[PDB]
Coordinates of C-alpha atoms in Angstrom, one line a residue:
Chain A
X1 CA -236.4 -16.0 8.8
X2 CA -237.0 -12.5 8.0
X3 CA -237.9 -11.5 11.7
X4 CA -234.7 -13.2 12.3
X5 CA -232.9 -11.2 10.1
X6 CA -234.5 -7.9 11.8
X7 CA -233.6 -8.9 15.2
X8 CA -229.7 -8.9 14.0
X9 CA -230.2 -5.9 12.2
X10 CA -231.0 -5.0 16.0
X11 CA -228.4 -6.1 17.8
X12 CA -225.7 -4.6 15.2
X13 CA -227.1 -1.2 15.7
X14 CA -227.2 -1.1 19.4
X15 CA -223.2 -2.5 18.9
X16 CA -222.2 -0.1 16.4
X17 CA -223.9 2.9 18.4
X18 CA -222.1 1.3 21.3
X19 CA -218.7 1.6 19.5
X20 CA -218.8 5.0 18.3
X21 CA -219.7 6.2 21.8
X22 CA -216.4 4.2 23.2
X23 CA -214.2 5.9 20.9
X24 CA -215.8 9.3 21.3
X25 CA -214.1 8.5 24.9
X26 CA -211.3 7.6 23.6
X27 CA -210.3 10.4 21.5
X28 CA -210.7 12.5 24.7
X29 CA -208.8 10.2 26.5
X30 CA -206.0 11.3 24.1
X31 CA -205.9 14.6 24.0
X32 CA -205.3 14.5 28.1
X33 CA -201.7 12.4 26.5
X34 CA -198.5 14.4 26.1
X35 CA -197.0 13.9 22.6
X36 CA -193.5 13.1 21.5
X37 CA -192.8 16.9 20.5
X38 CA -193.9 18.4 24.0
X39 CA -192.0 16.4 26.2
X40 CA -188.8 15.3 26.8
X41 CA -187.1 12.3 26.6
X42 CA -184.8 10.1 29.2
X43 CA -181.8 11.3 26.4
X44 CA -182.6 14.7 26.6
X45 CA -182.9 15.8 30.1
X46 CA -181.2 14.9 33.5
X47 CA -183.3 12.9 36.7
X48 CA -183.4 14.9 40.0
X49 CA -180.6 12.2 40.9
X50 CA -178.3 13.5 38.1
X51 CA -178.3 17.0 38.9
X52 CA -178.1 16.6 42.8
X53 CA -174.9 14.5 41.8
X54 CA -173.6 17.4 39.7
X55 CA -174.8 20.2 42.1
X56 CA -172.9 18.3 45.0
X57 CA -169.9 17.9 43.4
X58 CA -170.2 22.0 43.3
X59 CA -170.6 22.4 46.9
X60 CA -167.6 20.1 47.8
X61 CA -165.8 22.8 45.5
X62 CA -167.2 25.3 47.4
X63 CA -166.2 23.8 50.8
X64 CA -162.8 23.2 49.7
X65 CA -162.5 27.1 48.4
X66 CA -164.1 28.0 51.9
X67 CA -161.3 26.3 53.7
X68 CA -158.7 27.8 51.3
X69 CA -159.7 31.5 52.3
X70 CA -160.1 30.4 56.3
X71 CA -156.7 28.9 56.5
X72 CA -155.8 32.0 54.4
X73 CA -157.2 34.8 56.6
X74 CA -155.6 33.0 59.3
X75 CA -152.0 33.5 58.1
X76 CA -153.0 37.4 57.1
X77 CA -154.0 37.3 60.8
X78 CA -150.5 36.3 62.2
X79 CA -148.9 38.6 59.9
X80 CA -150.8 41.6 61.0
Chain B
X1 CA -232.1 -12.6 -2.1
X2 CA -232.4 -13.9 2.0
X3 CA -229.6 -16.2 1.8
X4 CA -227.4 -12.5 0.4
X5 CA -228.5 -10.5 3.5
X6 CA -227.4 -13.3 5.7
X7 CA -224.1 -13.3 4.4
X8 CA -223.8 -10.1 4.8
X9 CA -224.5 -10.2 8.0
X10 CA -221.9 -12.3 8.5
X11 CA -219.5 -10.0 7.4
X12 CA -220.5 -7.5 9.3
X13 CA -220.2 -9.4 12.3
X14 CA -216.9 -10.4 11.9
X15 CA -216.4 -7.3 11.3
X16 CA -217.9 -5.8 14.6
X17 CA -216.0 -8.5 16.6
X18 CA -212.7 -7.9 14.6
X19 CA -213.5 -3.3 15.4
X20 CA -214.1 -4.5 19.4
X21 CA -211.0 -6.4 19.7
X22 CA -208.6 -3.7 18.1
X23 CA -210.8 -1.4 20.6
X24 CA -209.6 -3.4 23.6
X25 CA -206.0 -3.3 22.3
X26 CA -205.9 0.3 21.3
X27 CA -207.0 1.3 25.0
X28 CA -204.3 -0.8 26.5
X29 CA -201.8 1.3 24.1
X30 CA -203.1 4.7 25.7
X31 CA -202.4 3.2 29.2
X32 CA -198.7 3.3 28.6
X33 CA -198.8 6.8 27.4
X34 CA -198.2 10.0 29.6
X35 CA -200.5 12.2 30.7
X36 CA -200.1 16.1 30.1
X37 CA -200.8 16.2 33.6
X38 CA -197.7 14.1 35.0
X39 CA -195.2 15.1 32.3
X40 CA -192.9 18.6 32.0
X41 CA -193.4 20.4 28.4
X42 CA -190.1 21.5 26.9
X43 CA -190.4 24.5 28.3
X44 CA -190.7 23.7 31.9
X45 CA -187.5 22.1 31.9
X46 CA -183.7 22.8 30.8
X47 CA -182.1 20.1 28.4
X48 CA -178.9 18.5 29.0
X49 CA -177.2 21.0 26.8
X50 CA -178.5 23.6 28.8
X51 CA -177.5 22.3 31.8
X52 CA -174.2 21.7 30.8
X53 CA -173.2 25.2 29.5
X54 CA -175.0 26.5 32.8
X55 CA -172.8 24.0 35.0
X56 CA -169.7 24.9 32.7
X57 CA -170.1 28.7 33.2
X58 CA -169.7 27.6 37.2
X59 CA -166.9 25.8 36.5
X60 CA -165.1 28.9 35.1
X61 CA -166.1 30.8 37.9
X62 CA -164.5 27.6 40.4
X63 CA -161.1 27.5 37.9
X64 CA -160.8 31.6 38.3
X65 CA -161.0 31.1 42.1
X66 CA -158.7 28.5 42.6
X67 CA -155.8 29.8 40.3
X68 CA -156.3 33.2 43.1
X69 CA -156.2 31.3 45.6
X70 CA -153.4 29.6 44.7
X71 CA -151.2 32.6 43.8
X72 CA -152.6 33.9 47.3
X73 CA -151.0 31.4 48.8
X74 CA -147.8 31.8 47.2
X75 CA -147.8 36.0 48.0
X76 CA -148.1 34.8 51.3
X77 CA -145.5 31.8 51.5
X78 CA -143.1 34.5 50.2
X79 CA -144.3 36.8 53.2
X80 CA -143.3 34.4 55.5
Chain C
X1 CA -239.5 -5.7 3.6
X2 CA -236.5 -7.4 2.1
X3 CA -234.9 -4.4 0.1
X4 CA -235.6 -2.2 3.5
X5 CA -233.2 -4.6 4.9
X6 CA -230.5 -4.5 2.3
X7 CA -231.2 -0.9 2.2
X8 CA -230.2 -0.9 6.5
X9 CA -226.9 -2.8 5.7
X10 CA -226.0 -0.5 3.5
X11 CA -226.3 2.2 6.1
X12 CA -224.2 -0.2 8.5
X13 CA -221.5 -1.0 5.9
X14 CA -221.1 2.7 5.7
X15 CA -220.9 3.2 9.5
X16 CA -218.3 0.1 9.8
X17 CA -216.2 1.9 7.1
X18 CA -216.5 5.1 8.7
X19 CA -215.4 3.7 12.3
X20 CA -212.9 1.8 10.7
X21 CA -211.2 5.1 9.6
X22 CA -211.7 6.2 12.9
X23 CA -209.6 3.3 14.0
X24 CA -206.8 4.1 11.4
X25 CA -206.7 8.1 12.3
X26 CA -206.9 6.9 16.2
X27 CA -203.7 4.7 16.1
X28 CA -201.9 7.3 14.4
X29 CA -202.5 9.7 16.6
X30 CA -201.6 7.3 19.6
X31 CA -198.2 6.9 17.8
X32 CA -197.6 11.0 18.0
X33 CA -197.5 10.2 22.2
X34 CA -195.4 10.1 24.8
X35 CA -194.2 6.6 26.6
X36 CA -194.6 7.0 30.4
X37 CA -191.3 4.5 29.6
X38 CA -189.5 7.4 27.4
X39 CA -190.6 10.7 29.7
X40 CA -189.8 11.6 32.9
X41 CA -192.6 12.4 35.1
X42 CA -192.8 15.7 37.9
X43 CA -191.2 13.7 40.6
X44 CA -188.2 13.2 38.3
X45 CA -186.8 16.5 37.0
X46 CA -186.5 19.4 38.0
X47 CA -188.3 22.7 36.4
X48 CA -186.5 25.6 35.2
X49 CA -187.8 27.5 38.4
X50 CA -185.9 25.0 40.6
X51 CA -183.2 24.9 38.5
X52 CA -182.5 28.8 38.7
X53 CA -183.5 28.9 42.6
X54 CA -180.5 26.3 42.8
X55 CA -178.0 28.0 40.2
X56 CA -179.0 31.1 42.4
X57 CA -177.7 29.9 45.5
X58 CA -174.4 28.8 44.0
X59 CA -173.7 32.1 42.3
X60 CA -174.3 34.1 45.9
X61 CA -171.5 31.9 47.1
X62 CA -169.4 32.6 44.6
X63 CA -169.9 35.9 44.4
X64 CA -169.1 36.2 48.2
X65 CA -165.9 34.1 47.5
X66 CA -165.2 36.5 44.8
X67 CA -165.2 39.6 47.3
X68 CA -163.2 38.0 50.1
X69 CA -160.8 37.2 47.5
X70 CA -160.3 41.0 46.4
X71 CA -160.2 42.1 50.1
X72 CA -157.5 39.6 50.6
X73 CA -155.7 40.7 47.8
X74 CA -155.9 44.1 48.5
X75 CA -154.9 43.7 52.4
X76 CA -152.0 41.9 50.6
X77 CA -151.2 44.7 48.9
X78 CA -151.0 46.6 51.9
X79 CA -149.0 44.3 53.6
X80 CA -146.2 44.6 50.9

């Protein structure tokens, strides 16, 4: 009974030296985590996709004012 | 005095097996958290509001250049 | 040989408590993380750097826009 009792006293060691060795891992495994106050949310920040959309709506501007001025240097042109 | 230890170890098997299974949950938790490594830090990237007064400084810029344009194109209708 | 034993689960009680803590501190800290479902990853968003390059480019075209307009306005002037 007693030799019994030794052989558990065994087996919880090895499994409690085993645990502390899986979360010694596992605290390093979280320090490689970024945490709520470093990053940025989905609310806070636009996708790639989102700022192409706004930066294209830009250069249609752009191309609209390009074609403005051409048509206008044209008619300066025929003036002159 | 034997039958004391053998509850006891009873407890503390329980609470091994209880520790091991809150283990096994607590690493599937860190598997949907992002790694430093993948994610931008707040100051790697522009918010929303700073995007927006950037994109609204351009859209100043385009409002200036089209009421020119505009009036160009009137100096010159009146030309002709 | 019997109060070595109760004097070992002492020692483990004292352990289990210990990791147990552990546990407790761990989970807190897991809460202070990002989600990979509430962050956007590299492949996402842009950095600041990209983001200038980009505002960059737009603000060269405006600022030739800007000097074709005042030549035009100025051969205008000369016209009249």
């Amino acid at each position: 009974g007693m030799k019994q009792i030794e052989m558990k006293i065994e087996e919880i060691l090895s499994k409690i030296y085993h645990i502390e060795n899986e979360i010694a891992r596992i605290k390093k495994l979280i320090n490689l985590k970024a945490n709520k106050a470093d990053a940025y949310t989905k609310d806070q920040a636009y996708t790639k996709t989102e700022i192409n959309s706004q930066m294209k709506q830009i250069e249609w501007k752009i191309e609209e004012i390009l074609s403005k001025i051409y048509h206008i240097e044209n008619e300066i042109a025929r003036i002159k």
